[PDB]
Design an enzyme around this catalytic site. Structure first.
Site, PDB file in Angstrom:
ATOM      1  N   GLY B  11       0.784  -1.217   0.000  1.00 51.79           N
ATOM      2  CA  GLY B  11       0.000   0.000   0.000  1.00 51.79           C
ATOM      3  C   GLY B  11       0.821   1.276   0.000  1.00 51.79           C
ATOM      4  N   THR B  13       2.228   4.171  -3.182  1.00 48.08           N
ATOM      5  CA  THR B  13       1.646   4.817  -4.328  1.00 48.08           C
ATOM      6  C   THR B  13       0.922   3.837  -5.270  1.00 48.08           C
ATOM      7  OG1 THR B  13       3.193   6.673  -4.132  1.00 48.08           O
ATOM      8  CG2 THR B  13       2.115   6.377  -6.256  1.00 48.08           C
ATOM      9  N   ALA B  14       1.610   2.795  -5.742  1.00 44.23           N
ATOM     10  CA  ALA B  14       0.985   1.865  -6.679  1.00 44.23           C
ATOM     11  C   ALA B  14      -0.207   1.111  -6.072  1.00 44.23           C
ATOM     12  CB  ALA B  14       2.009   0.876  -7.286  1.00 44.23           C
ATOM     13  N   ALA B  37       1.815  -3.301   5.241  1.00 41.84           N
ATOM     14  CA  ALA B  37       2.551  -3.403   6.489  1.00 41.84           C
ATOM     15  C   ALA B  37       3.191  -2.069   6.858  1.00 41.84           C
ATOM     16  CB  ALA B  37       3.608  -4.498   6.411  1.00 41.84           C
ATOM     17  N   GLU B  47       7.897  13.796  -7.010  1.00 40.12           N
ATOM     18  CA  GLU B  47       7.529  12.999  -8.150  1.00 40.12           C
ATOM     19  C   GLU B  47       7.053  13.949  -9.246  1.00 40.12           C
ATOM     20  OE1 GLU B  47       7.078   9.316  -7.390  1.00 40.12           O
ATOM     21  OE2 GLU B  47       7.046   9.037  -9.582  1.00 40.12           O
ATOM     22  N   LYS B  77       4.237  21.385 -13.815  1.00 39.61           N
ATOM     23  CA  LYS B  77       5.378  21.032 -14.659  1.00 39.61           C
ATOM     24  C   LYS B  77       5.056  21.241 -16.160  1.00 39.61           C
ATOM     25  CE  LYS B  77       7.906  17.034 -16.208  1.00 39.61           C
ATOM     26  NZ  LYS B  77       7.779  15.576 -16.348  1.00 39.61           N
ATOM     27  N   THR B 357       8.168   8.733 -15.730  1.00 43.17           N
ATOM     28  CA  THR B 357       7.346   7.610 -16.155  1.00 43.17           C
ATOM     29  C   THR B 357       6.814   6.745 -15.030  1.00 43.17           C
ATOM     30  OG1 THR B 357       9.376   6.354 -16.639  1.00 43.17           O
ATOM     31  CG2 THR B 357       8.308   7.424 -18.493  1.00 43.17           C
ATOM     32  N   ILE B 359       4.725   6.987 -12.255  1.00 46.84           N
ATOM     33  CA  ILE B 359       3.292   6.991 -11.983  1.00 46.84           C
ATOM     34  C   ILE B 359       2.555   6.528 -13.250  1.00 46.84           C
ATOM     35  CG2 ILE B 359       1.298   8.456 -11.263  1.00 46.84           C
ATOM     36  CD1 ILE B 359       3.131   8.331  -9.015  1.00 46.84           C
ATOM     37  N   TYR B 453      -3.369  13.894 -25.681  1.00 46.89           N
ATOM     38  CA  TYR B 453      -3.335  13.770 -24.203  1.00 46.89           C
ATOM     39  C   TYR B 453      -4.725  13.511 -23.558  1.00 46.89           C
ATOM     40  CZ  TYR B 453       1.480  15.783 -24.437  1.00 46.89           C
ATOM     41  OH  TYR B 453       2.796  16.055 -24.725  1.00 46.89           O
TER      42      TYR B 453
END
Lengths: 526, 524
Positions: B11, B13-14, B37, B47, B77, B357, B359, B453
């Site tokens: 648990g 970001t991904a 955990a 990021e 950005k 790349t 995220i 996009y």
């Protein structure tokens, strides 16, 4: 330095398309000459096309649809109609009965809508598989079939377009038109002469072409449009030809043109592909006449048998009817472009016209040639990439076409049985695998009509897409093993799709009631 | 039968991205649990992202850009600024002089204009090769470099967007945001526990995950988001990881967060990629702080050397500055999805964040996973197609990144010289050949921004396109052998192109005068 001089060898359709496209693309910066020798002329047996013929070819030339259509006596094509591909019997122009209706299905140019990011095909099959519909894929998902059944025009009397269409015409008229255009508007030099000798240098490049009259033509770049003979690419450059008869059994045709009384019977807004005992017959309606040809496998029928069964189908006298007897060269060169010699047209590759790709292969290749245009150093990467684009365009069509025969349920003749004994190419077996698993095969990035048939690169990358595959495969009766697993997680979407099938029904009913016949529309123009 | 139950392991970001996306895609038709955990958490080192984070991920969840941005204190950005990739010397934050100006180039999200069906890059190079311009590619072809030099906002005070942009943020904050969303609004069950034992069945599929507390979790589908450990994909299922250090030397990082006075200096609307002696250093500006990390090769610098050279760059004290020392796993699994186990995030693959790349790989894979979503019979064709999409996504990025190092002209340290001695992959060598021959590489089928996009399948298919290649290769100094042969056949096109360069010069000048600073816009 830049290419200064181009020699095109071969007239006919590809030759004058090449002359026109290059004449336009390089206008005023290269001298172009076409060498054409007279040949025994053939009957105009008809050519069927795809919509991007206007957007990728004639628009590039700056020729309005109305201008060329008028000069070529063209009619309109909304779909290919496949007749008798699922039922046993003789080769006949009448559709047999299958499950309560005619044995036909359409491959049309309509876009397949998405509903909640998933193609309508997948919702159709979901309902079909669970017995909520028995309607065929094409009638459920496209407005076209209902209006094609009634021979409707794709344009209203006021000119407004209601569906995507392309064209039926005599190829000879179009070649003529383009010859006039290239020579008169683009200063392409036309020389009537016969190639006698092709001179190569020590790098294997063509230095020059000597003719029977003794004239020598040198150029920086040679375009081979000589047809099946491949006078430059095969005879001079010795590039091997790859026979694709482990995928494609049809290698022959017998063809003619039949007068037609349009006032009494109307004009069909579609090409017909009528399954036969040992191949299939095209019907390409034009003005006052139709072109027709039995494409057959020499392995399963003699020329005489093909002649007899083609003539009997149309009630023609095989002893006196003017016929073209053609032996095709099916397949492609190992490489379309070698050294300074680019093959365009059937000198490059040919597959039977089951999906109306012959003219498309010409202008698609010319688009790729200009995209990969060399200078005199002939950078090899340009040649290599061009070759890869041609090889994929051909092989994907070969595969798609093979699938029309491989997946037919017919077992009634040695020809239909032998098709099931061939192998599908790896890439095609992969698509079939995906299709069985409920995946879209090359789903268009957009369900937008214009973005697809109006932007050539997009269309070239995604030439045979999910709509095309479902038309053919579901048409023939190959359906996935089970509905797309995603759909069970989309209960709202599978409820609401009802209104999408309903909007198709509404368009079908409304267009059937308000559209004039194709014949009505054609008379107004002429 | 359909997948009824999904267990996500890990648990960060991904994991929470996976929970949100699946929870949204399968809402009300699958029960999702996430196992996580309590770990020693890391500094938020920043990021950087790409524009389709909004359109492919947050939009899918139904979460407005304003909502998430505010809660994650995000900044904007517009580009990556590559600093000192062409000049010899020490790792410094300040650009060195090269040919009369600073050694920098930009890789922007701006779109390259077509002119007469041909990308502007090609006309630029033709003019450059023939001595008609000494202007760098990025300043000639894009409006962005000039307004980025002055730290302009990509939005006006009134809200209107004048250019494409993405986001800088602390991943820890976004992940929290996503945890709150998945748990409160999508019914995802959160279990705080460690994995102790993974039981497999006779077919080699995961049967259950048992935890340290003795709890047993079963599922139809298992999603490994356990990071570099690959507790499920590598350890339980035994899928080999493929190291790709034959293409990428960098395998380590030293990273931190540095306080920043925005009132005095403004905020940079770009990520900086600052070339170092043995790698490169990111700078990711956030609100009142920047995230920074020296990405380096352990074969060329020790951890100590890296620490010192990173701390000296930013005038940090190595004895007291909080630092993260990371050793990366570079490469990808042989297969991302095996049996009933799908890897998402760094459990699946990883490359250094030179092109933002990280995220993207999570939501791109999540998108592919839903597109190839199985039922309980796990059709092998869906798995194989998914795996093929992940391989390509990863390998193309691996190649594009290697190119940043391989074509740098630097020869001043062992690290820069050793990059030139690696091989490019066959696919990458083909692209470089095409590029040299004057060709566009993967030209966008469309000139249009929104369609690119804003349609994911379109961008996934065409992810590193001609604009990206030119930005980086021409930026570094690799240019074609000669102008595109076509242009000598288009005299009218090469004449009229001037008013296209003119229009860019215009927009440069105009936006430079009318745009607020990014600082100004953020304060609002």
């Amino acid at each position: 330095g830049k290419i200064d001089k181009i020699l095109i060898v071969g007239g006919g359709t590809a030759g004058w398309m090449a002359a026109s496209y290059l004449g336009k693309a390089l206008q005023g910066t290269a001298d172009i000459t076409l060498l054409q020798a007279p040949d025994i002329p053939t009957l105009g047996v008809g050519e069927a096309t795809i919509p991007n013929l206007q957007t990728a070819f004639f628009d590039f030339l700056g020729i309005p649809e109305d201008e060329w259509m008028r000069e070529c006596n063209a009619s309109y094509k909304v779909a290919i109609k496949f007749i008798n591909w699922r039922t046993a019997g003789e080769g006949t122009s009448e559709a047999r009965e299958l499950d309560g209706g005619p044995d036909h299905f359409y491959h049309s140019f309509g876009l397949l809508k998405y509903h909640e990011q998933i193609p309508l095909s997948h919702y159709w099959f979901d309902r079909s598989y669970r017995g909520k519909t028995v309607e065929p894929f094409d009638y459920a998902c496209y407005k076209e079939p209902v209006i094609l059944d009634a021979n409707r025009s794709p344009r209203r009397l006021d000119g407004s377009k209601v569906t995507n269409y392309a064209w039926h015409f005599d190829a000879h008229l179009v070649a003529d038109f383009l010859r006039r255009f290239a020579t008169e508007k683009l200063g392409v030099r036309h020389v009537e002469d016969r190639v006698e000798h092709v001179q190569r240098d020590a790098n294997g490049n063509i230095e020059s072409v000597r003719t029977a009259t003794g004239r020598v033509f040198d150029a920086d770049l040679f375009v081979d449009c000589s047809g099946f003979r491949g006078l430059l690419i095969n005879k001079a450059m010795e590039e091997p030809f790859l026979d694709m008869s482990d995928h494609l059994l049809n290698d022959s045709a017998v063809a003619t043109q039949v007068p037609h009384d349009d006032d009494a019977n109307g004009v069909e807004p579609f090409t017909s592909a009528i399954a036969m005992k040992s191949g299939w017959t095209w019907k390409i309606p034009m003005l006052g006449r139709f072109g027709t040809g039995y494409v057959y496998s020499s392995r399963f029928a003699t020329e005489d048998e093909a002649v007899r069964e083609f003539c009997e189908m149309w009630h023609l006298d095989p002893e006196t009817q003017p016929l073209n007897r053609i032996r095709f060269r099916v397949g492609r060169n190992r490489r379309a472009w070698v050294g300074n010699c680019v093959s365009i047209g059937t000198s490059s590759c040919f597959v039977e016209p089951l999906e109306s790709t012959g003219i498309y292969f010409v202008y698609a290749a010319l688009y790729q040639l200009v995209k990969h245009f060399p200078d005199k150093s002939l950078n090899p990467v340009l040649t290599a990439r061009f070759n890869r684009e041609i090889e994929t365009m051909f092989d994907d069509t070969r595969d798609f076409i093979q699938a029309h025969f491989y997946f037919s349920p017919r077992t009634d003749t040695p020809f239909w049985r032998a098709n099931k004994e061939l192998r599908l190419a790896d890439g095609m077996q992969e698509k079939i695998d995906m299709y069985r698993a409920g995946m879209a095969i090359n789903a268009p990035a957009s369900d937008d009509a214009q973005l697809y048939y109006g932007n050539f690169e997009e269309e070239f990358r995604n030439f045979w897409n999910n709509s095309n595959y479902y038309c053919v495969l579901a048409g023939l009766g190959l359906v996935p093993d089970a509905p797309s697993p995603r759909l069970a997680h989309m209960p709202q979407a599978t409820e609401s799709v009802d209104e999408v099938f309903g909007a198709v029904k509404d368009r079908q009913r409304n267009l059937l009631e308000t559209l004039p016949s194709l014949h009505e529309f054609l008379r107004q123009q002429h």
